[PDB]
DNA sequence: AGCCGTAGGTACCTACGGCT
DNA sequence: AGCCGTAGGTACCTACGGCT
């Protein structure tokens, strides 16, 4: 046993951290969008009551309690991924809202995480909703001391919505993000029908829709990618050529492509110039400013011909870029190439159990409460009987048989009764019981028809998407170019 | 280490000396690229007071204001040479925000005298408080400070310029009871 | 709008240096401590980190510290945090650590992110009874949080732990101290006001560094003890001893307060290796956690060994000064102080804190009087109470009823409304009758306390007597003559 | 970086490489240093299947291995000139601890293959409940996996050399799709 | 000289996969 | 190429006073 054999610790050790990094690192779930250290910021935010409504808290303590209650990594692992989660250029629906310098399009880092301050974003209270519902399973943090979400109610479609990346060990994953309102109207028409097929869905689902804006070529990348789960997906930035006077022009770019960093587009285009392999620049200047919005002008030689300059850069520069779709997430605790109607199916499927198990735990809630009030208003209709019972008893254990053998109480009817404050007894207490129990009874009802009816709790998912889509749903931003 | 802005013409242009690499990043995003530059400091500077020229001219945070100005140091000083005709000190709204203020300042007066005396040298008004520059937006650090519609600067005046080499070389020289006694008659604990 | 250049000098300078003297450099001469040190402890309180719960991450200790009272760099905290709990650095550690926390060879502590850290037992009393207004609190740096002016301080942690700092105009630099030694020097104060230096040094000889070592002579501890400034001998402990084949070494088994060891070896090496130092054949660190600090230097046959010792005296830490100038804030204000001074201000603050807390405690014990009267009114006529609350419509009116019908305040009626049930049975009847009957002797006590000076000054000698008792220890440093 | 031992008889002196700067540090205390040297890695470490000699001879982490073991490398290397008869891998018990130790084995296997032939390779076994090395008392590291009288060492045995080139070569190598085919077979285990 | 201890600090190796 | 994003990362500037 003190011996062990090259080949044998080498395929034992390689499998569990390349196995650690699909699961537990690299890949999102299906389910919530979401990799492990996100889930644990988010949720983090949640058990610190870090709501919209609430005032920001400082990072380092945001950070601090989530590193050591849930993910036992280095800070700056957890920082940057909170800190893109906050950036409008990197989330296409921002998880974080951020308070100080959070970065730029030109690849400045956030402020240290000292500087910084943090909360939910409204989005991200739909993630969140129900989770202290029994709708999902929480698990054993890393050391004992905790729980932690296993995965997030996720309210609205957020692996699709704000997309997802990775690299991970003998796979990676390259998810572009879409804008809501599409996403939700696709779950809406694969709920009314189970063979929808991909060219259906894509009448809501036009394509992918970038924070940044700019254009896709095309949707022929798009189509591929939706039916197979890979694609390449050309996206160019949002050109014009306009004149500059004494009959000059220009080219003016003012949306450039998703994950393009900015400054070093403009790096490489001066470099062109420079080492002479584009012909007709005359000057390149970035004139972005948080006024007017990202703007980059690059000058032409007079008589020269613009359009053949910009066809020039997009061919030579990333100001025309490609984005390699490779839908790799999650489904069964396992890395799966997925299409665009398995990721929504997922999806779906999530939000009907959510929302049964929210159903259930309602259910058991209110039935439980009825249990009391039932003990309670027999406490009242009796209540000169239930004192004396209570003072002639020497301790708690005597005064709850006694309860319970002489006016037929449970255990916690009992209970309920002898945590009682006196002031429940004045006059008009014995009627709010009866106001309460009857809306329960009430309550019960209904709840109970949902539990009954596939239907209706199928519904009552629709209801709720239909909801999220007018809250938070926004208008397309990338313009699909059938080109 | 700098972000120039675009226009040449040193008449309109102004440079931002930031504390901290941090308020740094916000001051470019905020800024007006054309006539605005910002060149960020990581923290306390060299005080020149206390140290050797040899010293002073291998320090880094010095030679890159040096370049940055354009105008040449001491002897070989030319105002008409100055790259901007506004440098601005911007520092933290705390005690090492002044600190650093007065090492910047102590930097000028003995180095590039006549850029106090042309009245290139500024101080910015950020917002009063306890929070400092790396914790503001960038959108809050232009409208409060770097914006000339609504932001309040003071330029540097020199007055009495004996009363000036005497008050540099009482709080930054190297003589610690002169600057103990100074400390101990203005205290207002 | 302009600035006078000479104003804004005078100004923004006075303003550091003034905050860096008060704020941030020097320690109150109360507690013994700097503000960073105090947000520390404090941070460790308002977290529940005591020594009976298990260690927390440090990087969650520093950041809860940082954001509520400490607007600085977390290194500047995690590193004053790391000193607080390495027995080389403080005679009595602050800190109890989990992880790499440092050695005497100046390797640094691990990252924030490894270590773990709760207080020691002995910080317990610098905490003690924080919560019974003994202390002022004042408003945090953004007026979102309370922090403390001041610890307790229920030993005299100043001189016990000692303190270092660079300020402006002004720096400050006091030893250690042994602690059964110096709470016998605040006992003698405490029966004589009038009590000298010189008797003062009867019970503290001198400083006790936690690396032990030896002091050459008492004349410059008598002079910082009467002055506040003095210049003080350190040793490291040396012996010379046979290594056989008529060899012989030098063992060094204590080396001086603050000095790096790693540092000394180096000079020492460097010494012979530039031939500066005549008759070492070698050097070696024997060090290690179960022998402890071993450092040897092997003579050269027939060579005179104690020679070579006292040359490493001259020409290496291995003999180091401490200069003692014992600055610290008194009410606020910077002062050199010499160690009389140092034991006045703590025994005032001492006097201060138990009255504090014996009135504090005088008022919640009348408050809780109070309210059980209440309730043992609502016991012995308790059909009448059931009845006027029932016929009451709401709250408001039960309130009024019960204050009108049984003379209860406010308070009292609240409570009784707010009783439960299960308070009627009889163990719960008779245990409101007993913290009653406790609660009105407890009352006494305390006022007996508060009506003669001569009592509460005893109660301090004798909690202080406590602390000696359960926390004092041997002298490690010894004072050659 | 390499905290050396006393005795230069390589018979009897071990070298531990040991995951990150902060359970180095731990691991100099705890150790006994007449026999027991060590040397901190960062972290993850040059992967030398995958990168060309350049790289590999550039490489700081590298270097500081050869020089430590003083044997030289590849085709120069001589058991005879081992520093140390004992090369102790120690990570922390985790996926990222397992992953440096493919590191150091894929190095070894390639540069150094007779020093694990000649059995002077080992892995460290330190306590396996959650903690990592950077957590760790200096006591707490001697008693567990560096004293002699209490530590339990596995030594690395290499048997058929075929099997292990195969899998270094599918595990380390550049090929992807050999090393997904692995994850997807195994993934059960 | 250069250390000491609280302050305003910092830049940059590595694995991993896909780009096609 | 080198960059995307989570992981195992880290050196070394300055101020300030008093001692050597
Ligand atoms: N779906 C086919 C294939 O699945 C796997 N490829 O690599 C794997 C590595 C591991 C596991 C697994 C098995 C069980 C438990 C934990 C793990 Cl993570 C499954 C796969 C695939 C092909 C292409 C892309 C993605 C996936
Ligand atoms: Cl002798
Ligand atoms: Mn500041
Ligand atoms: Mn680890």
Redesign the interface.
């Given at each position: 046993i003190?011996?062990?054999?090259?080949?044998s610790?080498?395929?034992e050790?390689?499998?569990?951290?390349?196995?650690?990094?699909?699961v537990?690192r690299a890949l999102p779930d299906v389910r919530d969008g979401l990799k492990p250290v996100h889930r644990r910021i988010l949720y983090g935010l949640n058990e610190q009551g870090m709501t919209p409504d609430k005032s920001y808290?400082?990072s380092?303590?945001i950070?601090?309690?989530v590193?050591?209650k849930y993910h036992?990594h280095?800070?700056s692992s957890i920082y940057e991924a909170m800190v893109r989660m906050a950036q409008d250029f990197s989330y296409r629906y921002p998880l974080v809202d951020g308070?100080?310098?959070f970065?730029?399009m030109?690849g400045?880092?956030?402020?240290?995480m000292?500087?910084?301050?943090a909360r939910m974003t409204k989005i991200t209270l739909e993630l969140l909703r129900d989770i202290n519902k029994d709708t999902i399973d929480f698990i054993d943090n890393?050391?004992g001391n905790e729980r932690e979400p296993s995965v997030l109610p996720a309210r609205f479609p957020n692996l699709l919505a704000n997309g997802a990346s990775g690299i991970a060990?003998?796979?990676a994953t390259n998810i572009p993000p879409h804008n809501l309102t599409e996403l939700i109207n696709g779950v809406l028409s694969l709920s009314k029908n189970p063979d929808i097929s991909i060219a259906e869905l894509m009448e809501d689902i036009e394509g992918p829709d970038f924070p940044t804006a700019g254009l896709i070529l095309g949707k022929s990348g798009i189509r591929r990618a939706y039916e197979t789960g890979r694609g390449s997906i050309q996206m160019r930035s949002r050109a014009v050529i306009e004149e500059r006077g004494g009959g000059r022009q220009r080219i003016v770019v003012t949306e450039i492509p998703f994950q393009v960093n900015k400054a070093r587009m403009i790096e490489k285009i001066a470099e062109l110039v420079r080492d002479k392999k584009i012909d007709g620049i005359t000057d390149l200047?970035?004139?972005?400013?948080?006024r007017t919005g990202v703007r980059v002008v690059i000058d032409v030689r007079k008589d020269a011909n613009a359009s053949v300059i910009l066809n020039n850069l997009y061919k030579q520069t990333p100001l025309q870029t490609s984005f390699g779709v490779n839908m790799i997430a999650l489904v069964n605790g396992?890395p799966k190439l997925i299409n665009l109607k398995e990721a929504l199916v997922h999806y779906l499927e999530h939000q009907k159990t959510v929302v049964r198990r929210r159903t259930q735990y309602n259910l058991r809630k209110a039935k439980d409460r009825a249990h009391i009030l039932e003990g309670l208003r027999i406490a009242l209709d009796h209540?000169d009987e239930?004192?004396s019972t209570?003072?002639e008893?020497?301790?708690?254990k005597?005064?709850m048989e006694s309860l319970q053998q002489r006016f037929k109480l449970s255990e916690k009817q009992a209970q309920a009764?002898?945590?009682?404050?006196?002031?429940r007894?004045?006059?008009?207490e014995r009627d709010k019981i009866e106001a309460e129990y009857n809306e329960l009874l009430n309550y019960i009802s209904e709840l109970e028809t949902i539990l009954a009816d596939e239907e209706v709790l199928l519904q009552l998912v629709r209801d709720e998407l239909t909801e999220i889509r007018d809250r938070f749903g926004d208008d397309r931003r990338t313009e699909i170019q059938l080109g | 280490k700098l972000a120039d802005c675009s226009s040449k013409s040193p008449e309109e242009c102004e440079i931002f000396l930031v504390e901290g690499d941090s308020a740094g990043g916000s001051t470019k995003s905020g800024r007006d690229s054309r006539t605005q530059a910002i060149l960020p400091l990581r923290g306390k500077i060299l005080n020149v007071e206390k140290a050797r020229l040899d010293r002073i001219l291998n320090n880094n945070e010095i030679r890159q204001m040096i370049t940055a100005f354009g105008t040449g140091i001491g002897g070989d000083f030319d105002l008409a040479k100055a790259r901007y005709h506004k440098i601005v000190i911007m520092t933290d709204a705390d005690v090492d925000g002044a600190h650093i203020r007065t090492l910047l300042l102590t930097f000028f007066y003995r180095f590039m005298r006549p850029l106090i005396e042309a009245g290139y040298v500024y101080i910015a008004q950020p917002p009063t408080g306890y929070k400092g520059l790396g914790e503001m937006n960038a959108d809050q650090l232009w409208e409060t400070t770097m914006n000339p519609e609504h932001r309040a600067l003071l330029q540097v005046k020199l007055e009495d310029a004996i009363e000036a080499d005497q008050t540099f070389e009482m709080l930054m020289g190297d003589v610690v009871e002169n600057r103990r006694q100074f400390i101990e008659d203005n205290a207002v604990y």
């Open positions: 003190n011996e062990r054999n090259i080949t610790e080498m395929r050790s390689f499998l569990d951290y390349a196995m650690s990094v699909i537990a808290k400082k380092a303590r950070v601090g309690d590193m050591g036992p280095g800070d308070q100080g310098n970065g730029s030109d400045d880092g956030a402020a240290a000292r500087y910084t301050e890393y050391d060990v003998g796979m200047r970035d004139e972005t400013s948080l396992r209540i239930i004192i209570i003072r008893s020497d301790t708690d005597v005064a009764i002898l945590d009682m404050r006196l002031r007894l004045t006059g008009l | -």
